[PDB]
Design a protein around this ligand. Structure first.
Ligand SMILES: NC(=O)c1ccc[n+]([C@@H]2O[C@H](COP(=O)([O-])OP(=O)(O)OC[C@@H]3O[C@H](n4cnc5c(N)ncnc54)[C@H](O)[C@@H]3O)[C@@H](O)[C@H]2O)c1
Ligand SMILES: NC(=O)c1ccc[n+]([C@@H]2O[C@H](COP(=O)([O-])OP(=O)(O)OC[C@@H]3O[C@H](n4cnc5c(N)ncnc54)[C@H](O)[C@@H]3O)[C@@H](O)[C@H]2O)c1
Ligand SMILES: NC(=O)c1ccc[n+]([C@@H]2O[C@H](COP(=O)([O-])OP(=O)(O)OC[C@@H]3O[C@H](n4cnc5c(N)ncnc54)[C@H](O)[C@@H]3O)[C@@H](O)[C@H]2O)c1
Ligand SMILES: NC(=O)c1ccc[n+]([C@@H]2O[C@H](COP(=O)([O-])OP(=O)(O)OC[C@@H]3O[C@H](n4cnc5c(N)ncnc54)[C@H](O)[C@@H]3O)[C@@H](O)[C@H]2O)c1
Ligand SMILES: O=c1[nH]c(=O)c2[nH+]cn([C@@H]3O[C@H](COP(=O)(O)O)[C@@H](O)[C@H]3O)c2[nH]1
Ligand SMILES: O=c1[nH]c(=O)c2[nH+]cn([C@@H]3O[C@H](COP(=O)(O)O)[C@@H](O)[C@H]3O)c2[nH]1
Ligand SMILES: O=c1[nH]c(=O)c2[nH+]cn([C@@H]3O[C@H](COP(=O)(O)O)[C@@H](O)[C@H]3O)c2[nH]1
Ligand SMILES: O=c1[nH]c(=O)c2[nH+]cn([C@@H]3O[C@H](COP(=O)(O)O)[C@@H](O)[C@H]3O)c2[nH]1
Ligand SMILES: [K+]
Ligand SMILES: [K+]
Ligand SMILES: [K+]
Ligand SMILES: [K+]
Lengths: 344, 344, 344, 344
């Protein structure tokens, strides 16, 4: 077997050491724009998020209202694919035709929206999603280091060329990244065993996963001239974990629990002895996938807007402490230290 | 004294990083066959388990019903030797004559069964066990790095040559493995201070023990052409620990607590305030060895079959995530990372 | 991004290994004097504390009574600047005119006192503080690696030259130290995420911060001939942490919680079911800064004098165990070992 | 300051890996004899304990009955010196004249006994102790790396030459050992911050302390031909810690809590709601030193004999697992591994 020189680590094991903060770095001047899909050196991504946050491909988080609410703030949602092709396409269509400063929209001023797909019924689901107006797709899987994903991306390329964007994942190392990059993925999702590994035994600390995949992505860019955006998926407990994920190289972040707490999540608001909660279950739980996970409750946080703006104001503030006015500048200037077990 | 460069680790400190999963790796195509006794390069083992699980040499787990139930699933039990020679031989005989797709049987279609022996009364116990039809024997001891075991194996060779198979142990390092290999053991058992060390002070994290013994076993194979199967004994808390043990090099796994929970274990089923439990005590407890351990209760799990098949389906699934269709392929392709203290 | 070879550590992870204790090292012969402001090689600091303790720039700790009580023992307080320029100046004036063996005083026998300033209204606050008689100033900020601080120090130099002393901070690495040193700081404060980091994600274990800044300060001294005193600010839970901070290179220590417990702190004494407590809130809490922190209670300790003398007697005693009669000798002879996670 | 490459560790962080156990290593054949005082290469120590255990120099453990009871088993007690010279001498005399297979006695068949002394009134205490018949003395101090101890040993040599044996300590590193060795100590005691460091901040994990001091002691032996026995003092929680301490190089072990639990300890037996306890307080507690420590209760264990024999049977058993029939052989053959934080 193959072993590693160092153990893997989670976001909770890191802290950022401040860099020079210039008089021009104030939160309001921080640009949180970020590329969503791959492009060649020298060019810009065809799709850029206004904020580096995307909602998880889950029944309990990415519904119509979520997609609309997040797009309004500059991010994008990936309508869950764990439902009929007709239902998902309908949700996508509803978001695209809803309108009939930081909002994420297309050339027709319609909100952007994503849609998750699986490596099984894509020959029928994809066309339906494209026709419905889906701006981007993403293969939804825990272990994306699979030939099934290569086959799915290949089919999409054969039928649509590079006109249909498709993210792939999840992977946690350079080999997995490399495989999906060569297969043609527009963006690669990072993360196995991090979300809200102690059942199947597969996974890797999210921080180590991001750091290693990013190094491979950069190596890949230097070899091919192709920059593939990567997504840190899961493992984000606190707002500062967002800044860490971005500083370590992730272009954007996918979150489930974070968004499930909002009024716009498609789950029922339930009051548990004085506390308003919201339902939240994984796609691997028996409660789903029947149209690897648990079924629980998250504290109600109110509307997405206020929470997202508060979280991002914190990120912007921290970025200025690190002397960065943009995500790429943060990824370049960030000083990241591991913290001792005892300190935690 | 002799010290080591790194501290030892337990199974709980590791995770598997996925490898390429091909379209042909589906759980139903995973072969869990594994060698039980030593053979030379180029040949096959005279005895191959259908599944890599064997029940512990304990009064509270390996009785007749257990031996039969496990053999039916492809594994083998080692009837405890902590009883009279006549009683143990009778149990062995009963299993061999019980019948008067994955079942483990001999050329006469009789279920395979093992029997534990000690380094004291073997001159009388062994012949009785051989006559009773025992398919394989195993010296039952915590510290197998002993001249007493060399003497026992030597006596068996002198009287039966290589016609009677005998496992030895336990050891936790290359030196101990080497000593039992040269003594003639057919398979070497790994593990001291792991089962369900804080009393005598001897032992080693199971993971480190397996990894180090396996490296020595491989070195030994390259030097002599003799492949000696090794058994990871104890320290398995969760199903994924099985996959880890196998990925690290163990050919098969010995378990006590895991099997004690089943209806077929020879212990009394007791109800403790709404919970059906089963008795489970170590061979080192005063409750035994009078014909180093504790006496407790384990939650009732039902019949062996359903539990074993569920556990192995998980192992098979994980093996496919690692791109392996067989145990040897898993041992070759597995990517194993240590996890930080804080992550746990 | 930039990463580090080792994780950071806190004071709790260290212990001092005794050195040779000579017959002349008795507690009463230990000199705790220490430089407060920078000087060139070969000279003495214009301001030397009698004891290496200074009270934090906080509303809940450094008021008039505190400043007087601490100065009487040989230390100095930094009257909080989170109040009107007129109020702070009045407090400073009151301390300077209060008197109208180890007391810290000026040539006119008046108690020494410090005052915190911010990088915003200093053009008006500073002159008022100088006129009021403030002996030293200190820019109060969490992230002192800022151009705003360079600008503030520069303004002070342009108007007062080196006649007005001003400390700066906080920083946690060599780069931050270097930046404030070149900007002209008279002393640099160390510490971010240590006080009584899990919200913004910035910081560093106090021990690592002190050790690294001190090495840079020493390197800086060798290159320029300028010795800049450094202050370990926050992260001191137990008395022995003081000895550690000093042994690691800090010239003096800034504390908040420690002094807030005293009768002389400006907070209300409140009895909570049999226990007399005192209020203590951070400057980052909403409870302040409205003229990043929590609002709590600390156990009443009585008058500053008895507590400070008890704490320092312990430090002196430990210094003798290390064979040191002075802080510089301690910094030179101290043997400091990290302790394992498990030992704690 | 001086730092170290690795953090220090405690006994709880180690385990012994078995070595070859020969047919001749049975517990009853294990020799636990060990040297108490220094000798030159090629010779034997003038005083050899029958068992490697000595009771602590404490008011709550080493009284007359303890000294007699331990000597009967082969060990020796050090009558506490924290009492009047007349009282201590009387206790020593009482043990020497008490009798007016493994017992530790002199040429006149009288039980051996030790006595603690301080670096203050030794000019009067020592002569009284020698006249009373004390077989060995030991300077009782937490930080023995002191000129006061050198002065005390020097005075003893000047007046008695090498006819009066005196142990010194405590130290935790090679430098401290070296200093007391050159000063003339007959045996050096190891241990600061281990007994039943979080107050003064000085100390070192007991295991690291023993390992480092032993390496220096061996280096010293090779340079001078003088073998100085070392004593692991404190930090022993479980019986197996004894085996570890000996395996790491300690010739003998000093214990307080362990012996305080016995009927023969000089403390009052008190019943606390169904549990018979015994008082146990440190020499640094206010409860003493008035003729750094806590005052507590330890569970009653009964008479010393049965407990000591049970503890040593375990040590002997473990020694055989390591292939050792004697302590020196154990120190030579022991395989000691550090254990991960998580494993504990
Ligand atoms: N990130 C994690 O750690 C994690 C863990 C568990 C579950 N999940 C989530 O649960 C949901 C399902 O994930 P998943 O990976 O278990 O589902 P998946 O569809 O990606 O799983 C594919 C695996 O390959 C098999 N297979 C056999 N033939 C196949 C074919 N023709 N095409 C594709 N696969 C074939 C099975 O489908 C098996 O599920 C997702 O939302 C995923 O994110 C995530
Ligand atoms: N794996 C562990 O960590 C662990 C720990 C404690 C107990 N156990 C279990 O307890 C049971 C007993 O194990 P054990 O090792 O204590 O028993 P064992 O029979 O292997 O022990 C042999 C040891 O050598 C001695 N000895 C002296 N003469 C001997 C002779 N002629 N032949 C053999 N030994 C001689 C004693 O028997 C002593 O018990 C086993 O089932 C074992 O698995 C396991
Ligand atoms: N040490 C720590 O870890 C920590 C953490 C949080 C808060 N605090 C305390 O809270 C109090 C406030 O600290 P702070 O650093 O948040 O306040 P600060 O005044 O030092 O913060 C300056 C930051 O730059 C911005 N800025 C924009 N224009 C500016 C200008 N012209 N001049 C200066 N800054 C400008 C904002 O003021 C922003 O607060 C202090 O007492 C500080 O010690 C300490
Ligand atoms: N091992 C530990 O970690 C630890 C910690 C605290 C206390 N203790 C115990 O408490 C008891 C007292 O230990 P201690 O070291 O505090 O006492 P000690 O007598 O060894 O201490 C000597 C120190 O030097 C000073 N000194 C000044 N003049 C002196 C002189 N002329 N001679 C000697 N010392 C002079 C003081 O006495 C001061 O106590 C002992 O039993 C000791 O084992 C042990
Ligand atoms: O172990 C898992 N069991 C599940 O049932 C499950 N469902 C989703 N996911 C994955 O978790 C991400 C969301 O994580 P957070 O809630 O931590 O943001 C998601 O974006 C997915 O990557 C699962 N992981
Ligand atoms: O410390 C011990 N004290 C005992 O009394 C004892 N009895 C058995 N064994 C050993 O433990 C293995 C079973 O472990 P699990 O329950 O963890 O599967 C078994 O297979 C044995 O190796 C003991 N170990
Ligand atoms: O995280 C923080 N939030 C706050 O609100 C805050 N207020 C003060 N400080 C800083 O803490 C130091 C005092 O710490 P102690 O109480 O630990 O001595 C002080 O000297 C400051 O450096 C803060 N840090
Ligand atoms: O920190 C301490 N405060 C005290 O008051 C104290 N009194 C004794 N000792 C030392 O501890 C040893 C006994 O330890 P155990 O109870 O762990 O065997 C003893 O042998 C001494 O080395 C003290 N250490
Ligand atoms: K900064
Ligand atoms: K895979
Ligand atoms: K000393
Ligand atoms: K052995």
């Amino acid at each position: 077997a193959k072993y590693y020189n160092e153990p893997c680590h989670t976001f909770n094991e890191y802290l950022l050491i401040p860099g020079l903060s210039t008089v021009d770095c104030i939160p309001s001047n921080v640009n949180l724009s970020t590329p969503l899909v791959k492009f060649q050196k020298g060019q810009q991504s065809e799709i850029n998020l206004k904020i580096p946050l995307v909602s998880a491909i889950m029944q309990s988080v990415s519904g119509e209202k979520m997609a609309i609410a997040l797009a309004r703030e500059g991010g994008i949602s990936f309508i869950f694919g764990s439902q009929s092709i007709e239902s998902q396409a309908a949700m996508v269509h509803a978001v695209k035709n809803f309108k009939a400063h930081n909002e994420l929209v297309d050339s027709q001023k319609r909100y952007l929206v994503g849609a998750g797909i699986n490596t099984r019924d894509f020959r029928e689901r994809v066309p339906a999603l494209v026709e419905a107006g889906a701006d981007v797709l993403c293969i939804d899987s825990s272990d994306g280091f699979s030939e099934w994903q290569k086959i799915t991306i290949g089919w999409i390329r054969e039928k649509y060329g590079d006109k249909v964007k498709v993210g792939a994942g999840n992977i946690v190392d350079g080999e997995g990244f490399r495989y999906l990059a060569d297969a043609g993925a527009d963006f690669i999702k990072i993360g196995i065993g991090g979300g809200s590994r102690e059942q199947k035994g597969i996974g890797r600390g999210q921080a180590t996963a991001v750091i290693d995949v990013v190094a491979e992505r950069n190596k890949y860019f230097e070899e091919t001239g192709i920059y593939i955006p990567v997504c840190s998926d899961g493992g984000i407990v606190y707002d500062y974990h967002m800044t860490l994920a971005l500083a370590m190289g992730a272009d954007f972040i996918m979150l489930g629990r974070y968004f499930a707490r909002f009024e716009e999540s498609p789950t029922r608001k339930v009051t548990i002895n004085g506390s308003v909660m919201k339902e939240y279950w994984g796609e691997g739980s028996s409660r789903a996938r029947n149209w690897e996970g648990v079924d629980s409750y998250v504290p109600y946080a109110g509307k997405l807007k206020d929470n997202v703006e508060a979280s991002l104001n914190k990120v912007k503030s921290t970025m200025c402490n690190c002397g960065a006015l943009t995500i790429p500048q943060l990824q370049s200037k960030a000083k990241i230290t591991l913290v001792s077990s005892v300190s935690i």
